[PDB]
Amino acid sequence: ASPSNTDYPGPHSFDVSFQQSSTAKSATWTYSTELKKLYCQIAKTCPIQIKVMTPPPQGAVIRAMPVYKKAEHVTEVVKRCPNHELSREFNEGQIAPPSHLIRVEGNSHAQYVEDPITGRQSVLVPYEPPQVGTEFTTVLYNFMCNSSCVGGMNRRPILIIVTLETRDGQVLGRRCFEARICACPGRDRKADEDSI
Amino acid sequence: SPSNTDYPGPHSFDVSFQQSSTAKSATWTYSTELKKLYCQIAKTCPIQIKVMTPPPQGAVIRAMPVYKKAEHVTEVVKRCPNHELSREFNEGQIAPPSHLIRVEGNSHAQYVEDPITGRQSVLVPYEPPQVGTEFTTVLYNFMCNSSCVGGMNRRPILIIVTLETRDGQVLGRRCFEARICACPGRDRKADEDSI
Amino acid sequence: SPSNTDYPGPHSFDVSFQTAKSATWTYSTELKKLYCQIAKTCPIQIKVMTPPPQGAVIRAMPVYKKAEHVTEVVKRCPNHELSREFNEGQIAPPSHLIRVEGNSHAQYVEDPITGRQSVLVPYEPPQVGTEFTTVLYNFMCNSSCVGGMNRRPILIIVTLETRDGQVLGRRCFEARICACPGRDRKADEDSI
Amino acid sequence: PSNTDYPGPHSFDVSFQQSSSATWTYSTELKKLYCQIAKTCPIQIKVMTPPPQGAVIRAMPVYKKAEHVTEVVKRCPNHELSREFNEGQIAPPSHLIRVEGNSHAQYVEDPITGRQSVLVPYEPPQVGTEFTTVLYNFMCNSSCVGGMNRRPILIIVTLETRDGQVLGRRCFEARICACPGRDRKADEDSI
DNA sequence: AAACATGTTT
DNA sequence: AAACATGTTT
DNA sequence: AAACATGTTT
DNA sequence: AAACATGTTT
Ligand SMILES: [Zn+2]
Ligand SMILES: [Zn+2]
Ligand SMILES: [Zn+2]
Ligand SMILES: [Zn+2]
C-alpha cells in the first residue's frame, strides 16, 4: 500500500528537528522551519535530532523512508538513479546497497531493508537514548542522489518519512518533511523562499 | 581509430540536408558550413544521400559516431547508463539499448558492435533514389543529449556516414559534427553568434 | 620509530590509486604524494597475490617525514578535536588523524607504550572479479593546522599485519591534506 | 550590550595618537584600530568633570555583524592552552582583552549572559596631563580558526560607576592581526 | 616591505 | 577558476 | 558568489 | 519564445 505520511506524535511524543544552519557561504545543508523542507548537497552528511518524552520499548528502531510528494508518483518507489548506483564512487563502503537513496553513517547496527512485497527501500537504526544531559538523539544521514537526477527523480518533489517503530514493526510515531538534495542548498533555499 | 577524412569515393558519395527554418522550434536544423547539425533527443532526422554511379550489391551505409576531440577519439560512444534502462525508447527492443544512433523506418537495418574495437554502428542496405529524385533519405534518431551525465558530457562528437560494400571495404565517406540537444534553435543561432 | 621501508611482503602487498575543476583529492604517480581536502573521503586500492592469514588486518598510520619530528606523534590539532564538527560519529576518537569510513569492524587503537595512534581494518578479499580491495579514508586535519602539523611534511604507513600483529607487508606514501589539492599539486610539480 | 556612543555627564572620551612595522596603528575616521597579537596598546581617556568613587572602566569586546552579536567573544581553543601568554595566570586563559600594568584590574565574566570583560579603577590624569592612558593586550588574531574567523569585532570601552550603572561609553572597531601596517594602508586603499 | 603559502570568497 | 585575505618567510 | 550551460516549465 | 531550474565554471 502507499506509506502513511500523516504526522503522528505517538504515545512517547516522537518529534524530530534540526538547528542552526546559517548561509555560511555554502553550508553543506540547511532546513526551513515552516516549509518542513530541507536542502542539502549530495553525499554530504546531515544531522537530525530525535526528541522523546516517555522511553520506548525494546526493539525501538527508527525507519527512515523516502517517497514522492506528488500524487501520480506516490505509486512509484525511490531508488538511486542507474548512474550513481554503478559509478562506484560512494560504493566502496559496500555496507549499503548501491540502490538505496538514504544512508545512515556512523552506526554499525543500522540495517538496510527492502520490503519484499512492495519493493520499498528503507533504513533501520536501533534507538539509543539521548546523550546523558541532552534530550535529542542525533542521527547521521546521507542522501545519494540529486533530487534532479536524470532517470532517478527528475526534480520530482520527494519527502522523507522518519518513523519510530517497535520490535515487531508496528508504528509508535511518525514525522515527516520534504527534502531537496541538490547542489547549492544555499541558493535553492533563499531563491526558493523568495518566489513566494 | 576510424577515419574521418572526407572521401567522395568512386561513385561520388555525397550527403546533405535541406530547409530547416527556425520554425519556432524545429525538431532539428543544420548549418551549411559548420557541417554541424543540432537536433532534439529521440526526434527523427532526415539525411539525403546522392550518388553519380550506381554502387555494388552489398551497398550498405554505416552510420557511426565518435568524438571530435583528440584525447577522446580513443573512447567509444554509447548511450549513458540512465537512458539505456529508463525503458522509454526501449520498447522497440529491435535496437540495443546502448547504441546512440538508430535508423527508423527500415526493417533491414542491422545494429552491429565491432567485437574487436567495441565500436557500435548501424548498417542499412542502400536503396536507389526515388524514381525522379536523386537523394536517398534515411531516418536517424539520436538517443542521448550530447551533454548527458556520464555519457558525453558536452564532449563535441561527430557522425561518420559511410558507403560500404558487401565485404565491408569503404566506397565513400562523408562526415559532420552533431549536437543532439534541447533547443537546436537557440544552440544554433546562439552558436553562430559567438563568432 | 616505526619502519618506513617499502616491504612487498610474501603475499606481494601493494597499494595504488587511479583536475576535475576541484577534485576532492588527487595523487602523483612518482612523488608517491597524495593531496586531498579536509574531511572529504579518499579511496585506496589494495592488491595481493597470495591470500593472507586469518587476522589479516590493515593498519594505517601517520608519521612525520622530516627527521627531527619522527620522534613526535601525529594527533589532530586542539581545535579540530573539540569543534564538535566531524565529532558526532563519536565512533572515532576526536584525536586521531586518520579515519576509515564505511566499515563497522574498523577499530581505532592508540599504542599504550609509544602513544602512537593508528586504525585497523579487517582484510576482506577483493570484489569477485576485481583484485583491489578499496578502503575509505578520511583525514581530519589540514597538513598545516596551527599547533598540529604546521605544514610539516607527513606520510602515511599502510601496512598489512597478521592476527598477532607481526608485519606481513608495508607500503608508504606522503600525504598533504590541504585545501585545493588541485593547485597545490600542479603548482607543486611545477616548482621543479 | 549597547554600542551607541554616549558622551556621558563627565564627557567621557577616548583617543589615541601618533602611530606612523609599528606594533599597532589607529585610523581617525574608521574608528578602527589594528594591532599585532599580544603586543601592548595604549588608549587615552579624557574627562571634563571628575567621576564618582567606584569610577571603573570596563572594556568589552563583541561582534560588529548582526547574526553574531548574539555570540560571545572568547580566545580560541588553541591560544587558551598553548600556555604561552598563560604564565601570568592572573588573567583567565579565555578572555580576549587584558590590561597590563595595573594590579587592581579584575577580570569578570557575567554569570547570566556569559559575556567576559575587564574592569580597571579610574585613576585621574597625570598631574599636568588630561588623558589617563590604559594598557591593553589582545590575545587572539581577529582571524583565529574557531575563534573569530575574521569576523569584524569591536571594543566597548565604558566608564561605569561603583554600583555598575553606565556613566559614559565610546566604541571602536579592532582588528588584531599580523601586519597592522599593511592591513591598514591596504585597507583604506580598497575604498 | 615584498613575496609567498594557503584557506575562503566571489 | 580567479581574486583575495592573512600570517609567515625571505 | 556570480556567470554560464542547458534541459523543462510557463 | 521567454523565464526559469539546476548543476558546473570561473
Ligand atoms: Zn543519481
Ligand atoms: Zn543519455
Ligand atoms: Zn586541525
Ligand atoms: Zn587564537
Q: What is the DSSP string of A41-109?
A: -SS-----EEE-SS---SS-EEEEEEEESSHHHHTS-----TTTTTS-TT-SSTTS-TT-SEEE-S-SS
Rounded Cα distance between A118 and C168, Å, is: 48
Range list of H helices, chain C: 67-70, 183-191
Rounded Cα distance between B7 and B75, Å, is: 23
DSSP code, position A148: T
Q: What's the angle, vertex CA A10, arms to CA A166 and CA A20, rounded to 5?
A: 100
Residues whose CB falls within 8 Å of the CB of residue C142, separated by 6 or more in sequence, listed in order: C38, C148, C149, C177, C178, C179
Rounded Cα distance between A150 and C18, Å, is: 27
Chain E footprint bases within 7 A of protein beta carbons: 1-3, 5-10
CB C119 within 8 A of CB C109: yes
Rounded Cα distance between A155 and A158, Å, is: 9
Q: Which helix (H) or strand (E) holds C25?
A: strand C25-28
Q: Which candidate, C52, C36, C56, places its Cα nearest to that of C44?
A: C36
Total Cβ atoms within 10 A of residue C150:
11
Chains B and C lie in contact, requiring 3 or more CB pairs less than 8 Å apart: no
Q: Is the dihedral of CA A90, C35, C139, C171 positive or negative?
A: positive
Residues whose CB falls within 8 Å of the CB of residue C36, separated by 6 or more in sequence, listed in order: C24, C25, C26, C42, C139, C175, C176, C177, C178, C181
Rounded Cα distance between C36 and C181, Å, is: 5
Helix, strand, coil percent values for chain C (each to nearest 5): 5, 30, 65
Residues whose CB falls within 8 Å of the CB of residue B96, separated by 6 or more in sequence, listed in order: B111, B113, B120
Phi then psi dihedrals of residue A164, to 5 deg = -90, 110
**CATH number of this structure's domain C1-192, picked from the four choices 3.40.50.720, 1.10.10.10, 2.60.40.720, 3.40.190.10:** 2.60.40.720
Q: What's the angle, vertex CA A13, arms to CA A12 and CA A14, rounded to 5?
A: 95
DSSP code, position C138: E
For residue A191, say whether its CB is under 7 Å from any atom of strand H: yes
Q: Is the dihedral of CA A32, A35, A36, A40 positive or negative?
A: negative
CB A159 within 8 A of CB A176: yes
Provide the greatest CA pair distance for chain D.
46
Cell matching residue B40: 532534439
CB-based burial, D170-191: b 16+ in 10 Å, e otherwise: bbbbbbbbeebbebbeeeeeee
Residues whose CB falls within 8 Å of the CB of residue B164, separated by 6 or more in sequence, listed in order: B58, B60, B61, B62, B123, B170, B171
φ/ψ region of B152 (left if φ > 0, alpha if ψ in -120 to 50, else beta) reads alpha
Cα–Cα distances in angstroms (integers) from residue D160 to residues D96, D123, D156, in the given order: 20, 13, 12
Rounded Cα distance between B7 and A188, Å, is: 52
Q: What's the angle, vertex CA A29, arms to CA A28 and CA A32, rounded to 5?
A: 160
Identify all chain B residues contacting A154, using CB atoms and an 8 Å cutoff: none
**Backbone Cα Rg of chain B:** 16
Phi then psi dihedrals of residue B63, to 5 deg = -120, 120
Query: D83 in helix, strand or coil?
Result: coil
Structure-solving method: X-ray
Q: Which helix (H) or strand (E) holds D158?
A: strand D153-160
**CATH number of this structure's domain A1-196, picked from the four choices 2.70.160.11, 3.30.70.260, 2.60.40.1180, 2.60.40.720:** 2.60.40.720
For chain B, list residues whose CB is within 8 angstroms of any CB belonging to chain A: 80-83, 85-86, 148-150
Could you write out the DSSP letters of every residue in B44-65? ----EEE-SS---SS-EEEEEE
Nucleotide nearest to D178 (CA to C1'): F7
Cell matching residue B137: 533519405
Q: Is the dihedral of CA A167, A170, A175, A176 positive or negative?
A: positive
D2 by Cβ neighbours in 10 Å (0-12 / 13-18 / 19+) ranks as exposed
Confirm or deny that D179 is annotated as ligand binding: no
Q: Which fold has domain D1-191?
A: Immunoglobulin-like (2.60.40)
Query: A190 in helix, strand or coil?
Result: helix
Query: C69 in helix, strand or coil?
Result: helix
**CA dihedral defined by D106, D110, D115, D117, rounded to 10 degrees?**
-10
Rounded Cα distance between D27 and D45, Å, is: 17
Cell matching residue B9: 569515393
B104 by Cβ neighbours in 10 Å (0-12 / 13-18 / 19+) ranks as middle
Rounded Cα distance between D154 and D69, Å, is: 10
CB C15 within 8 A of CB C44: yes
Residues whose CB falls within 8 Å of the CB of residue B131, separated by 6 or more in sequence, listed in order: none
Rounded Cα distance between C97 and C61, Å, is: 9
C30 by Cβ neighbours in 10 Å (0-12 / 13-18 / 19+) ranks as exposed
Which of A93, A138, A140 lies nearest to residue C103, judging by beta carbons?
A93
* Ligand 1 centroid distance, CA of B41 (Å): 20
* Ligand 2 centroid distance, CA of B83 (Å): 5
CB A148 within 8 A of CB A84: no
Give chain C's end-to-end CA distance (angstroms, integer). 31
A172 by Cβ neighbours in 10 Å (0-12 / 13-18 / 19+) ranks as buried
Cell matching residue D43: 588608549
Find residue A126's DSSP bridge partners: A61
Q: Inter-chain contact A95–C102, Cβ cutoff 8 Å? A: yes
**Last residue before each break in chain A (C–N > 2.5 Å):** none
Total Cβ atoms within 10 A of residue D69:
12
Ligand nearest to the CA of A80: 1
Query: A163 in helix, strand or coil?
Result: strand
Nucleotide nearest to A23 (CA to C1'): G1
Q: Which candidate, B132, B133, B126, B97, places its Cα nearest to that of B113?
A: B97
Q: Which candidate, D69, D55, D75, places its Cα nearest to that of D122?
A: D55
Rounded Cα distance between D174 and D152, Å, is: 8
Please report where in the chains the cell 542522501 appears, as a residue: A143
List, edge to edge, every strand of the sheet that includes A37-40.
A29-32, A37-40, A171-180, A158-165, A61-68, A121-124, A111-114
Give chain B's end-to-end CA distance (angstroms, integer). 31
Phi then psi dihedrals of residue A181, to 5 deg = -60, 115
Range list of H helices, C82-191: 183-191
Total Cβ atoms within 10 A of residue C3:
11
Cell matching residue C31: 612523488
Identify all chain C residues contacting D82, using CB atoms and an 8 Å cutoff: 147
Rounded Cα distance between A105 and A107, Å, is: 6
**Last residue before each break in chain C (C–N > 2.5 Å):** 18
Rounded Cα distance between C158 and C160, Å, is: 7
Confirm or deny that D177 is annotated as ligand binding: no
Cell matching residue C102: 564505511
Cα–Cα distances in angstroms (integers) from residue B110 to residues B30, B55, B62, in the given order: 26, 19, 10
Identify all chain D residues contacting C77, using CB atoms and an 8 Å cutoff: 78
Q: What's the angle, vertex CA D9, arms to CA D4 and CA D11, rounded to 5?
A: 75
**Considering only the top CATH level, what class is B1-195?**
mainly beta
Q: Which candidate, C6, C22, C9, places its Cα nearest to that of C174?
A: C6
